[PDB]
Symmetry: D2
Subunit: 136 residues, 4 copies
């Protein structure tokens, strides 16, 4: 609930994500979910359903990036140290893309996070992402 | 150079969701591809402070690697990302444009592998190293 | 049969030999190897602490050999890339299992993802992604 | 000198590494060079002599790991947190493989390192590597 508002305030600070119309769907002590509307991130004909892979990447980087608020009691923006995204299969067209990330380790200066993109069930994610973030 | 530059530029223009970043193609040829992200377009926090958002540089570098496929493909096509890693060596300097360079280092029948880096002043001490793989559709 | 191929491949790997790695199962859906903990000890053997480097070998080997799940006949596919991330330490005094499944196959590249775990696959020690060259 | 003999001692205590016959070629404040003799890497026909990816993974993981001695005053083993390896091209047979690495960021609990593997010419790397390591 407070995380919900902090997550939203992180997000609204991001211009490129404004264009993409990302919204926060949920924010627990369990992690963070964001939503990418397919219509804001089309490559080519909007008639066809096709979401730019680069939008999904932004979604994931941002989800990891913001999920840091589930473990930082205060609000800060943690610069990126490392990021890997690996796509398992292409997105379905005409379907919103969700991202989930979840901090799995926290040290004095670094936060490690892991998540995935999916559409229907989290069971067969579009892609996996792992990132480390500096707090300094 | 020119034909590959024209292609790279047309390619970039299709990426509408990030056109807000003001990304430009500086150079393209058989040996690789250079894009630029103007810093004013990616500030996080106060515009007075000139700090570039990390997620902007991801886009720059995802986009750079993707488009560098033009350097090896005979025909224009847009190649979906399969895998990307970006590893930041050191923080970007504030109030300075960020450049991305990439070069394809392996081409198979359906996959192109590419390596590059972000930097600001000179390529010598890059901000971040990047490797990605792309699907020839 | 697929299983026999997995084992042949593993036996070629003359340098893992020290680790006592075995193939636990192998079907179309993927591959499970095993690292017995007595073969990867750091420090006092009575302390049963598994060396991280052994697990990295385990995961690398599992990915590299998982290519038998999709390849018609025996072939050793060179590494193109490896991504390994550790979620938490291994528990002492327990074997480590490695699982991997090919999730994409192109004419000359095979992409596999896997993880390492001890009791249940539930919360793996580590995640690994890899691509390998074929033909 | 003192780094060199500390690097050698870190490496003597690894078993798999001794079967590979890994040695410390060079070590200073700059970073760490390890050697992998080709004979110990061969998979298959020894005359054909194809060097196994796995032996190079061990090489780099170990090089990255031990390079921490350049930045740690006292002896300690730092477990791998994450590793990335990307081959530019296959190793040549019948040539030893050298692994270099150098810490580029040090944090209270994390050391980040980067390096590469090569044979004759350090400017033609067969592979690139970055890893993060924990100090306990
Ligand atoms: Mg720390
Ligand atoms: Mg192919």
């Amino acid at each position: 609930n407070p995380l919900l508002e902090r997550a939203r305030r992180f997000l609204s600070a991001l211009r490129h994500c404004q264009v993409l119309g990302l919204t926060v769907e949920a924010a627990d002590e369990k992690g963070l979910t964001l939503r990418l509307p397919y219509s804001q991130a089309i490559i080519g004909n909007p008639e066809s359903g096709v979401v730019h892979g680069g939008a999904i990447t932004t979604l994931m980087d941002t989800t990891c990036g913001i999920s840091t608020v589930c473990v930082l009691p205060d609000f800060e923006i943690c610069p990126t140290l490392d990021l890997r995204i690996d796509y398992m299969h292409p997105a379905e067209p005409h379907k919103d893309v969700y991202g989930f990330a979840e901090c799995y380790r926290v040290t004095p200066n670094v936060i490690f996070t892991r998540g995935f993109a999916y559409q229907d069930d989290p069971g067969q994610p579009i892609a996996h992402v792992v990132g480390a973030f500096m707090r300094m």
